[PDB]
Design a protein around this nucleic acid. Sequence first.
DNA 1: TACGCC
Length: 19
Amino acid sequence: KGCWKCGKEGHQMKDCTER
DNA sequence: TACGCC
Ligand SMILES: [Zn+2]
């Protein structure tokens, strides 16, 4: 539930600052 | 930034 890369919900990869 | 960054 959220971003897997950094750990910030609201995005996942595209939209992260990392991968 | 975020824009795939793989
Ligand atoms: Zn993220």
